[PDB]
From a paper:
Although the catalytic domains of 17 human ARTD/PARP enzymes are homologous, unique features in the TNKS1/2 catalytic domain allow the development of tankyrase-selective chemical inhibitors. We have previously developed tankyrase inhibitors bearing a 1,2,4-triazole moiety and binding predominantly to the adenosine binding site of the tankyrase catalytic domain.
As a consequence, in the following optimization campaign, the South 2-chlorophenyl moiety was replaced with the 2-fluorophenyl group of 23 resulting in acceptable efficacy compared to other substitutions. Next, all possible hybrid combinations were synthesized employing the East moieties of compounds 20 and 21, a South 2-fluorophenyl group, and three different West moieties revisiting the 2-pyridyl-4-methylsulfonyl moiety as well.9 From these six molecules, compounds with the 1,5-naphthyridine moiety (10, 11, and 12) showed approximately 30-fold improved cellular inhibitory efficacy compared to their counterparts with the 2-pyridyl moiety (13, 14, and 15, respectively). A water molecule forms bridging interactions between the pyridine nitrogen and Gly1058 and Tyr1050, and the same applies to all the cocrystal structures described. However, compounds with this naphthyridine moiety were less stable in microsomes relative to the corresponding East-pyridines, and consequently, 13 was short-listed for mouse pharmacokinetics studies.
Residue numbers in the entry: 951 to 1110, 1115 to 1160
Write the structure that this text describes.
């Protein structure tokens, strides 16, 4: 592996930026905490910057290709990712080959602009079994991990699929009175995202 994790001082403005974004994007969900647990705040334990030259060159290369297909604009956004695979991803990069067939927008890798949404997916689809130790989707004890990722969206198709629709690079899923409540984002190519910050945390009891 080429990956090294550099720990950030809570003193650091880089930490405080990611901390602020994570806490501020939390929302009350429709499921009543069923999937991700009940909370309005996290206990931010550790923020590490992920450094891999090969993984970075994979990303910046793809980003250039998208820009030339999208009027010299990458449409780069910083978004959250949640999944069982976080420990794999920080070493090997995103891999679409492990994408899940069932999922509102087909076999892609899902992202959120709301940390609380991405949280729901950490122990699997709709929380799965919950935490390995207590089998509790609302565990306040077991430490969790999200990624705060640099994601190249390109020309994003809006919608309420194996790949992107033609002439598009992503899908922006959108709120729907009989569908989504917040925005999802989906890529169909692992090189269109970089896992930049690894966040270790727990959800807090009100
Ligand atoms: Zn637990």
């Amino acid at each position: 592996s080429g990956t090294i994790l550099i720990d950030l001082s809570p003193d650091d403005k880089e930490f405080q930026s990611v901390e602020e974004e994570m806490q501020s994007t939390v929302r009350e969900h429709r499921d009543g905490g069923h999937a991700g647990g009940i909370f309005n705040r996290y206990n931010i334990l550790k923020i590490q910057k992920v450094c891999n030259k090969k993984l970075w060159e994979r990303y910046t290369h793809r980003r250039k290709e998208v820009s030339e297909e999208n009027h010299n604009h990458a449409n780069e956004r910083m978004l959250f990712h949640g999944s069982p695979f976080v420990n794999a991803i920080i070493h090997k990069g995103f891999d679409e080959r492990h994408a899940y067939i069932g999922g509102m927008f087909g076999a892609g890798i899902y992202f959120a602009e709301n940390s609380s949404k991405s949280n729901q997916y950490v122990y699997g689809i709709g929380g799965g079994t919950g935490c390995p130790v207590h089998k509790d989707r609302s565990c306040y004890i077991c430490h969790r991990q999200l990624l705060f990722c640099r994601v190249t969206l390109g020309k994003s198709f809006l919608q309420f699929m194996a790949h992107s629709p033609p002439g598009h690079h992503s899908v922006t899923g959108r709120p729907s009175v009989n569908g989504l409540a917040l925005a999802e984002y989906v890529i169909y190519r692992g090189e269109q995202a970089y896992p930049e910050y690894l966040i270790t945390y727990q959800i807090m009891r009100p």
